[PDB]
């Protein structure tokens, strides 16, 4: 995350780290046995780490559980990143506590203007590379579809929204992919893509989760 701050211990308790020997993507816990992340984070052999703050230090608050299965959306397009969502089922149920909580799915979509919290362990340097080890947070608003589409012409679909600041400065970045965008206590977005990180006129693009709630609910119930 660039221009964000250190969240702190368990302030984003639904945050997950996807690990395949190292941390490669983020995710959101939606109930004791399921995690939603981005389809471009699919890898085989995923281990989910819950209650993580520093991904390089075990502080006795974690739960390391392997995935039993992954489901990438039927319409995921890896070229356009349209429908970039995937579900990961956990082998055993995580134990929910103060440090590990699930986030709720929305009943409606959020409006431009709404303030969201974006979190993750991705790069922190726009012009450079720095990978933090503690969780970073960023409060950003949903931008208007017009400001989003003028920034990426012919590339935004109804399944994507933009959030951030056009002045550049703060934004999601490499690593943070798969992570949550929570607005008014609901999981409304998933970090999906952007043009570099925090550049002027280049906000991040997020999967608009409100368009997949019936697919999520149906898929989890039959798997
Ligand atoms: N600028 C962004 N918000 C962004 C987020 C995730 C990415 N994954 C590759 N590039 C990315 C860029
Ligand atoms: Ca740790
Ligand atoms: Cl992350
Ligand atoms: Zn990350
Ligand atoms: Zn990515």
Curated annotation (Swiss-Prot):
Give EC number(s), comma-separated: 3.4.21.4
Transmembrane segments annotated in the record for this chain: none
What PROSITE patterns does the record point to? Answer: TRYPSIN_DOM, TRYPSIN_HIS, TRYPSIN_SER
Coiled coil (residue ranges)? none
GO terms in the biological process aspect are: digestion; proteolysis
Residues annotated as binding substrate: 171-172, 174-175, 177
Keywords, ordered alphabetically: Calcium, Digestion, Disulfide bond, Hydrolase, Metal-binding, Protease, Secreted, Serine protease, Signal, Zymogen
Q: Which InterPro entries match?
A: Peptidase_S1_PA, Peptidase_S1_PA_chymotrypsin, Peptidase_S1A, Serine_Proteases_S1, Trypsin_dom, TRYPSIN_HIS, TRYPSIN_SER
Q: Binding residues for Ca(2+), per the UniProt record?
A: 52, 54, 57, 62
| PTM note | Subsequent cleavage after Lys-125 leads to alpha-trypsin. Further cleavage after Lys-170 yields pseudotrypsin. A cleavage may also occur after Arg-99. Not sulfated on tyrosine residue(s).
Primary location: secreted
- Name the organs or tissues of expression: Synthesized in the acinar cells of the pancreas.
Q: Which cysteines are joined by disulfide bonds?
A: 7-137, 25-41, 109-210, 116-183, 148-162, 173-197
Q: Name one GO cellular component term.
A: extracellular space
Localisation: Secreted, Extracellular space
Catalytic residues in the record: 40, 84, 177
- Extract the Pfam families matched here: Trypsin
The entry assigns this protein to a family as follows: Belongs to the peptidase S1 family.
Q: Which PANTHER family match?
A: RIKEN CDNA 2210010C04 GENE, TRYPSIN-RELATED
Record note on quaternary structure: Interacts with SERPINA1.
**The protein's name:** Serine protease 1
Say which species the protein is native to. Bos taurus
């Amino acid at each position: 995350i660039v221009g964000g701050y250190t969240c702190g211990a368990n302030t984003v308790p639904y945050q997950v780290s996807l690990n395949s020997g190292y941390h490669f993507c983020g995710g959101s816990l939606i109930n004791s046995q399921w995690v939603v992340s981005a389809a471009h984070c699919y890898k085989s052999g995923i281990q989910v780490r819950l209650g993580e703050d520093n991904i390089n230090v075990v502080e006795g608050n974690e739960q390391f559980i392997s995935a039993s299965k992954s489901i990438v959306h039927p319409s995921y397009n890896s070229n356009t990143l349209n429908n970039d969502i995937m579900l990961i089922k956990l082998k055993s149920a995580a134990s929910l506590n103060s440090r590990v909580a699930s986030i709720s799915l929305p009943t409606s979509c959020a409006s431009a203007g709404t303030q969201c919290l974006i979190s993750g362990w991705g790069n922190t340097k726009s012009s450079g590379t720095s990978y933090p080890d503690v969780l970073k947070c960023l409060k950003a608003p949903i931008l208007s579809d017009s400001s989003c589409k003028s920034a990426y012409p012919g590339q935004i679909t109804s399944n994507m929204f933009c959030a951030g600041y056009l002045e550049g400065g703060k934004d999601s970045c490499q690593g943070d992919s798969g992570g949550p965008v929570v607005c008014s206590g609901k999981l409304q977005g998933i970090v999906s893509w952007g043009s570099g990180c925090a550049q002027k006129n280049k906000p991040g693009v997020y999967t608009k989760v409100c368009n997949y709630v019936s697919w999520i609910k149906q898929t989890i119930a039959s798997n």
